[PDB]
Design a protein around this ligand. Structure first.
Ligand SMILES: O=C(O)c1ccc2nc(N3CC[C@]4(C3)C[C@@H](OCc3c(-c5c(Cl)cccc5Cl)noc3C3CC3)C4)sc2c1
Ligand SMILES: CC1=C(/C=C/C(C)=C\C=C\C(C)=C\C(=O)O)C(C)(C)CCC1
Lengths: 228, 10, 211, 13
């Protein structure tokens, strides 16, 4: 039941989503490098820096994004990056990875200077995502919805963000219905994951301050996108 | 800040 | 319906120095909040310890949603349940202007512009109440199941009442993320006020803030 | 643990 309009929108989204890659030079380290809180931190920093670049590119290609005011573009990226990265991590942790990558990446994140107070909820959210059995189209669209959120701090023209978001929600709603007609509230449940992504924003500012007081340093890109 | 601005016009 | 919208609306209707006044109204409404939750279908059938968990997790959001909605009539502020109308200037004098502004803009204004009705409010609050992510639930799956019942009953209500607004169910659900960010910021302030020994914090409210 | 809240939940409707 997608309309041709919706099909065009979906195709633009998936083309942009599918370019999302983490280089082998980074992911090889999961297995190859030593295991210390220090090296685990460096690995994660390398992953985060790469993923922020990937996300900036995805965001630039979202429908209408280019037509938004330049400062509002920046406010959307800053406001949504953490949530997009949690959702991407949820996708990664419920996906088949090369041999050994899932288990050892989990061990490294659990011994990277992140308190158990934030580890536990993080892996709990990854589990709730796994249980939804999301398709690639659901991940892509939900990510795009997170990025084009009108409530982020410092967005001036909220109304125009809100308009770009609307047809993504429409497509996502028809898709959920078509794919999981036996869980007719699957769309609502995805929106409920949006609410829960908001908690990871708070958790993340705290993780960053803990990392900083244990004298970990971030790349220049990360310092910008997350306000140091 | 500098970097993000640049990546957005690339 | 195994989660009737008229029983959700019935629950709403059944219960229908600014930092100090707000805190006082919160304590008052905490008594009435538990009465509200007992009226939501199937909540009192959950394990007691889970009921405890759900209210401890959601109380701040449940209350913020209720006063935001009530405030639709007032100009530039908040109608408390005690009948005091808190305005922008007193809020900002008190060092809580930022939070107060977000409530007005992300909640009161959007509820007013979309004309959120009381059935819709009650349903949203029941979703908040049935939060299956809450830490320590003995059975997360049945709280998820009850949420799923609200979602299904709310969606049917929006199709029946607002057939010309197919996006309306989504727009309602999309108030919930902003309510959660606002709720987290309120809690931050409150545990920040406790950490420095600030304001008069009354009995039930203090109990919600202890570990 | 949480005495007011426990009492109120165990009280009437
Ligand atoms: O092995 C593979 O094949 C493979 C393929 C793709 C792939 N994509 C990966 N990632 C994308 C999101 C991901 C990991 C990068 C994020 O960065 C870690 C990170 C986080 C963070 C974490 Cl801790 C979890 C979720 C969200 C975030 Cl913000 N916070 O700070 C950092 C860095 C220390 C500064 C977490 S890991 C990976 C592995
Ligand atoms: C929003 C408000 C914050 C938190 C309030 C909370 C958690 C609930 C209020 C309930 C009321 C006021 C119920 C009613 O009157 O119906 C605090 C105090 C941190 C600062 C001032 C703004």
């Amino acid at each position: 039941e997608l309309t041709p309009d919706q099909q065009t929108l979906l195709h633009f989204i998936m083309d942009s989503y599918n370019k999302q890659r983490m280089p082998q030079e980074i992911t090889n380290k999961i297995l190859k490098e030593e295991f210390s809180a220090e090296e685990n931190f460096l690995i994660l920093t390398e992953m985060a820096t790469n993923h922020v670049q990937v996300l900036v590119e995805f965001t630039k290609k979202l429908p209408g994004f280019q037509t938004l005011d330049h400062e509002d573009q920046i406010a959307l990226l800053k406001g949504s990056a953490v949530e997009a990265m949690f959702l991407r991590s949820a996708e990664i942790f419920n996906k088949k990875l090369p041999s050994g990558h899932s288990d050892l990446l989990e061990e490294r994140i659990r011994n990277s200077g992140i308190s158990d107070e934030y580890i536990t909820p993080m892996f709990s959210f990854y589990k709730s995502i796994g249980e939804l059995k999301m398709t690639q189209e659901e991940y892509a669209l939900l990510t795009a919805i997170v990025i084009l959120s009108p409530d982020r701090q410092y967005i001036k023209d909220r109304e125009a963000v809100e308009k770009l978001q609307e047809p993504l929600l429409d497509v996502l709603q028809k898709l959920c219905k078509i794919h999981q007609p036996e869980n007719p509230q699957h769309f609502a449940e995805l929106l409920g994951r949006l609410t829960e992504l908001r908690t990871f924003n708070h958790h993340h500012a705290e993780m960053l301050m803990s990392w900083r007081v244990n004298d970990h340093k971030f790349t220049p890109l990360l310092e910008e996108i997350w306000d140091v | 800040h500098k970097i993000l601005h640049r990546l957005l016009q690339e | 319906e195994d989660m009737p919208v008229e029983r959700i609306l019935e629950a709403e209707l059944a219960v229908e120095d600014p930092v100090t006044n707000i805190c006082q109204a919160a304590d008052k409404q905490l008594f009435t909040l538990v009465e509200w939750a007992k009226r939501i279908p199937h909540f009192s059938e959950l394990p007691l310890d889970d009921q405890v968990i759900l209210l401890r997790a959601g109380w701040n959001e449940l209350l913020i949603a209720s006063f935001s909605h009530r405030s639709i009539a007032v100009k530039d502020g908040i109608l408390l349940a005690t009948g005091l109308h808190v305005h922008r200037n007193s809020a900002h004098s008190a060092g809580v202007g930022a939070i107060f502004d977000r409530v007005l803009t992300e909640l009161v204004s959007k509820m007013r512009d979309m004309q959120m009705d009381k059935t819709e409010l009650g349903c949203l609050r029941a979703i908040v109440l049935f939060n299956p992510d809450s830490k320590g639930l003995s059975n997360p799956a049945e709280v998820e199941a009850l949420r799923e019942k609200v979602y299904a009953s709310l969606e049917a209500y929006c199709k029946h009442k607002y057939p010309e607004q197919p996006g309306r169910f989504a727009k309602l659900l999309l108030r919930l993320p902003a309510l959660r960010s606002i709720g987290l910021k309120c809690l931050e302030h409150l545990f920040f006020f406790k950490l420095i020994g600030d304001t008069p914090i009354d009995t039930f409210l203090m109990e919600m803030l202890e570990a």
